[PDB]
Amino acid sequence: MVEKGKMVKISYDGYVDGKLFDTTNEELAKKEGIYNPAMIYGPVAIFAGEGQVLPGLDEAILEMDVGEEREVVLPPEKAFGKRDPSKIKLIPLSEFTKRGIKPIKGLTITIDGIPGKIVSINSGRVLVDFNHELAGKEVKYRIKIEEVVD
Numbered sequence: 001m002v003e004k005g006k007m008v009k010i011s012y013d014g015y016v017d018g019k020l021f022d023t024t025n026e027e028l029a030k031k032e033g034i035y036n037p038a039m040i041y042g043p044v045a046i047f048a049g050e051g052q053v054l055p056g057l058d059e060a061i062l063e064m065d066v067g068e069e070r071e072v073v074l075p076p077e078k079a080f081g082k083r084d085p086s087k088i089k090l091i092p093l094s095e096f097t098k099r100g101i102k103p104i105k106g107l108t109i110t111i112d113g114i115p116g117k118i119v120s121i122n123s124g125r126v127l128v129d130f131n132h133e134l135a136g137k138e139v140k141y142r143i144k145i146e147e148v149v150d
Contacts, residue, residue: 083136
């Protein structure tokens, strides 16, 4: 068990549809072809149960021992969230063209700093999904508590 608020350093590998999409392990990232030169790899310091990681990860961490490694399967609600219909919004084509942006199906756009993916364009109506890319997805993580500070 790890008490809520306790500083812990964790390592993790995250998978969606059987594919690694995130990892603290630089070597694994290169091996799996997701290495990002702009990312700082290595264990991540969190406070246990304080919401710095996905809800289901925080939940698992509180149950875990220092040095424990386990795998966890998280439903959307405990991962990147359910795909919320209220975040899928209709916007006039007119407003994109006014702003010199050509809407294209599949294109990621940013409104007021918020990223959104264009679902469709039909008769001047642009449907944009502002949900997280992985919303509605089951994810699987390997997670290890490397150390507890305190």
